[PDB]
Amino acid sequence: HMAKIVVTGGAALHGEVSISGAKNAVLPILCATLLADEPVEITNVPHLHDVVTTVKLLGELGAKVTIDQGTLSRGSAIVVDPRPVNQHVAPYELVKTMRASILVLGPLLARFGAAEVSLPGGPVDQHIKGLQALGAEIVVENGFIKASAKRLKGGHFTFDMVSVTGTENVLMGAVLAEGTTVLDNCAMEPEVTDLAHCLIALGAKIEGLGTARLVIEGVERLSGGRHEVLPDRIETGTFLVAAAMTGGKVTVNRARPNTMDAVLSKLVEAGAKIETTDDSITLDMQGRRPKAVNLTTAPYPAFPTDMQAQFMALNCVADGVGVINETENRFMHVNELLRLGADIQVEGHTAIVRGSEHLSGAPVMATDLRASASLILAGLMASGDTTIDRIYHLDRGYENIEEKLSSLGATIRRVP
């Protein structure tokens, strides 16, 4: 099932917007509330199907959860009371739709000494091996991961492959373990660091933040408290790119600029004038078209692959030639940009984009986030109307990018 949005191109974007929290921060953070003694308020929560599922999962585990729904200008506020949690078995009927559900394994094991989570549909060894390094007995039977541990005990563990959710799950197991834990080859994404910041706010002792080596001094209990989820750096970048490629001027509020260095530096190369505070970013093109940019995606803190499709759209309308290097087949959106008249040639992992002033609106299809963000952005400058058919599960309502782009002067409408 597919609804349409219709973009009328041409206008420079002007105004201010705010973004909400990053998905890969909020999901483990919601699971971490199971570790706490008192209620925990999580603010800046985005609207995502996975957030809704996780809230439902916490409730079925026995937590009392309330949701103050977010708006265009602020994320949701979720209060989790973990005290009445009385289940260590995660229900398959909910878990089966959300791979992130593996993130309850660490907390439930630490809180209850036992935990059961279904194997995902479709990797998992880093979670099992890492928790075993803390002394858990873990077996897989009948498609369930079954874990038990009288008392988790600090130890040394090195990840074989870098894993964001692996790092998070083992970290949550370590904060209440007896003694000191050292994890090597940890994921370094800011979403991991935001989880660690949340745990510290609740009483955890973690050193080495932002690096591949985390040192955890186990404490007996975590308290309740409050945590504002790290702003979504990908959303922030998307609005900055949309401002840049329309020759406009936008200010993004409640941002976290020190998670965006590589992106902001690339926008400067495109001709943007950028100022940053401790919580805002202002981009001003001063009436200029963007210059085409070259980029290569690389692990954080280098240029993020999750911004590549958006910069490709920028290059499609920029002055000059831009070469994009993708280090997985990450160019599904190319043929859709070609329907708009873009000049893109793909050679292996490299896309060469020659920018043009003559993109023309046409019907296009978006079946994933990359196609969606890139096609909406291209639509902002294509002549006439771009009609984007988007798959149903991408719909985020008030946090669809087109809703905030409209508030910046774009002409975009949903046509069911």
Binding site for phosphoenolpyruvate: residue ranges?
A: 23-24
Q: How far apart are CA 127 and CA 170, in angstroms?
A: 7
C-beta separation of 65 from 81 below 8 A: yes
C-beta separation of 82 from 31 below 8 A: no
Amino acid code (one letter) for 162: V
C-beta separation of 71 from 398 below 8 A: yes
Q: How far apart are CA 334 and CA 346, in angstroms?
A: 8
Q: Per CB under 8 A, does 120 bind a copy of itself?
A: yes
C-beta separation of 376 from 4 below 8 A: no
Kindly indicate which of the ranges 16-24, 172-180, 231-239, 332-340 contains the residues binding a copy of itself, using the contact rule CB under 8 A. 332-340
Binding mask 70-109 for a copy of itself (x = CB under 8 A): ----------------------xx--x-------------
Q: Per CB under 8 A, does 52 bind a copy of itself?
A: no
Q: Per CB under 8 A, does 139 bind a copy of itself?
A: no
Amino acid code (one letter) for 60: E
Q: Least separation, in Å, of the C-beta of 147 and a copy of itself?
A: 17
Q: Per CB under 8 A, does 395 bind a copy of itself?
A: no
Q: Least separation, in Å, of the C-beta of 356 and a copy of itself?
A: 12
Binding-site residue numbers are 23-24, 99, 123-126, 306
Q: Per CB under 8 A, does 142 bind a copy of itself?
A: yes
Q: How many residues bind a copy of itself (CB under 8 A)?
A: 24
Q: How far apart are CA 194 and CA 191, in angstroms?
A: 5
Choose among 175, 170, 194: nearest CA to 29.
194
Q: Least separation, in Å, of the C-beta of 84 and a copy of itself?
A: 26
- The DSSP bridge partners found for residue 364 are 388
Q: Per CB under 8 A, does 325 bind a copy of itself?
A: no
Of residues 49, 66, 143, 273, which one binds a copy of itself by CB under 8 A? 143
- In order of 172, 276, 278, 281, 372, the CA distances from 257 in angstroms are 27, 7, 7, 7, 24
Query: Which CB sits closer to a copy of itself, 132 or 387?
Result: 387
C-beta separation of 26 from 51 below 8 A: yes
Q: How far apart are CA 243 and CA 315, in angstroms?
A: 13
Q: Per CB under 8 A, does 362 bind a copy of itself?
A: yes
Q: Per CB under 8 A, does 256 bind a copy of itself?
A: no
Q: How far apart are CA 389 and CA 1, in angstroms?
A: 10
Of residues 122, 287, 348, 416, which one binds a copy of itself by CB under 8 A? 122
Binding site for a copy of itself (CB under 8 A): 92-93, 96, 118-122, 140, 142-143, 332, 335-336, 338-341, 360, 362-363, 365, 367, 389
